[PDB]
């Protein structure tokens, strides 16, 4: 449509998944990842130890839940931080996870529970 319609875009998810975490003077249950080149991060995605998304099968070495919106094209993040931050130690988060196609949700949930993260059932 010449201009029948223009879609300006959509707003990225906000960092509201965190419900309870061990609040300490330093960063407890919060780890910094060096962003993987040409990789875009969002809130709720599950990360590996190296800093990449867990993929079908790779679901037992799940390491953290990303809580930032990183843009791979500008290499800065939502808040202008040049790092990727995710909750890895004991904490409580909503059930809003971005799992890459094929990922078993139960396996990553069990891995994060073993590492100390508990997921509160979230309504729709």
């Amino acid at each position: 449509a010449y201009q029948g319609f223009t879609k300006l875009g959509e707003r990225e998810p906000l960092n509201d998944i965190i419900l309870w975490e061990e609040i300490t003077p330093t960063g407890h249950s919060r780890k910094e990842y060096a962003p993987v080149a040409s990789t875009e991060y969002r809130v709720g995605e599950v990360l590996k130890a190296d800093g990449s998304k867990v993929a079908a099968g790779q679901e037992a070495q799940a390491d953290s839940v990303c809580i930032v919106n990183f843009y791979a094209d500008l290499q800065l993040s939502y808040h202008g931080q040049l790092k990727v931050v995710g909750i890895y130690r004991d904490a409580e988060l909503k059930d809003l996870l971005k799992l890459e196609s094929g990922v078993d949700a139960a396996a990553v949930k069990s891995a994060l529970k073993a590492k100390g993260i508990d997921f509160v059932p979230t309504g729709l």
Binding site: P25, Q81, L82
Partner: protein
């Protein structure tokens, strides 16, 4: 009046404590050329406008004329920031039974400990601020850990200029290098008119100054001003040299880090040779007052409740009480990034030759 050295029954008097606070260099911070520009966001944008003027040719009165000049170009850029956080705590074990040094029998109170810790924290933040200011004078603002935050030259599309003095050559034209530097600063800043209220101030280390002052073409002028009639936080009466409308302030400031690696303030990245001198030249626009938009530092709010979307301050000291009266927890935050709006005026001078 306290207990003697070898006897508990005889008395001796205590006269004070001698403090050994380390060197806190504050030359650039003391200059006041970095205006503070706090805002309410984690990222700020700036608009760049460019002008161009040409001489207009004569025309006839009895015909017409012409002169449409051309328009300006407007483009804008973004900017990240640096976050610094310091953690400290106070416990009764640091108060119970401990006497204040320099006092015979006065115990230490919580106020004294808090004041000491706050003074140490503010000193650490001032040291970091001075380091970042000197980094910004280099045109690349790099954190002490080595992570780059803002490359001014790439963002402003300006090529960094370096001047090789070649001070080891007995017949090196020092005047030529000084004039080349001065013309580069004059041609590159396009502040129109307002510029260098004062001189082109060159901040050099000991090696560059020592090699410069002994040059045969310069020694006569240097010895001319070794006369009493002709402002650091540590090194009072710093070495200074005036030649060709240019000042050669010597600044031997340095700081350590967590890893124990000395961070010399005046250094070029990659020149590890001790036989070559390093200097940085910048225009002293500190007297411009509110019109000094060339050098600025921005502050942003801390990520705590009640401070979001608020103007940032330079330090954010927070006091928290531990559970069951176990002690007091402290937190000092600073979300700042210094930058230069005209990086073409930042030029490095080397004592070697290209």
């Amino acid at each position: 009046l306290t207990n003697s050295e070898k006897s508990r029954f005889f008395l001796a008097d205590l006269t004070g404590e001698v403090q050994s606070i380390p060197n806190t260099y504050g030359y650039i911070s003391g200059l006041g050329l970095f205006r503070s520009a706090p805002q309410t966001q984690t990222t700020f944008l700036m608009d760049l406008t460019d002008w161009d003027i040409s001489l207009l040719d004569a025309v006839d009165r009895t015909s017409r004329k012409a002169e449409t000049s051309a328009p300006e170009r407007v483009r804008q850029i973004s900017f990240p920031m640096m976050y610094f956080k310091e953690v400290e705590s106070i416990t009764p074990d640091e108060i119970q039974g401990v006497r204040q040094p320099g006092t015979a029998n006065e115990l230490t109170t919580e106020a004294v400990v808090r004041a000491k810790k706050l003074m140490k924290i503010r000193t650490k933040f001032d040291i970091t601020r001075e380091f970042l200011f000197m980094q910004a004078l280099k045109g690349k603002v790099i954190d002490a850990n080595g992570v780059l935050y803002a490359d001014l030259y790439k963002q402003f599309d300006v090529t960094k200029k370096t001047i090789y003095f070649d001070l080891d050559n007995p017949n090196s034209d020092i005047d030529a290098h000084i004039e080349d530097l001065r013309m580069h600063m004059e041609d590159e800043a396009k502040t129109g008119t307002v510029i260098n209220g004062e001189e082109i101030h060159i901040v050099v280390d000991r090696t560059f100054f020592s090699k410069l002052i002994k040059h045969p073409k310069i020694r006569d002028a240097y010895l001319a001003q070794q006369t009493p009639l002709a402002t650091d936080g540590v090194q009072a009466h710093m070495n200074r040299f005036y030649y060709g409308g240019v000042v050669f302030v010597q600044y031997n400031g340095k700081f350590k880090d967590k890893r124990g690696k000395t961070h010399t303030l005046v250094s070029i990245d990659g020149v590890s040779d001790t036989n070559v001198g390093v200097g940085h030249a910048f225009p002293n626009v500190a007297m411009l007052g509110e019109a000094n938009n060339i050098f600025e530092v921005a502050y942003a709010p801390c990520p705590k409740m009640g401070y979001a979307n608020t103007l940032g301050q330079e330090l954010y000291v927070f006091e928290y009480e531990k559970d069951r009266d176990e002690g007091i927890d402290f937190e000092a935050h600073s979300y700042m990034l210094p930058y230069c709006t005209r990086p073409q005026l930042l030029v490095d001078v080397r004592s070697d030759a290209e």
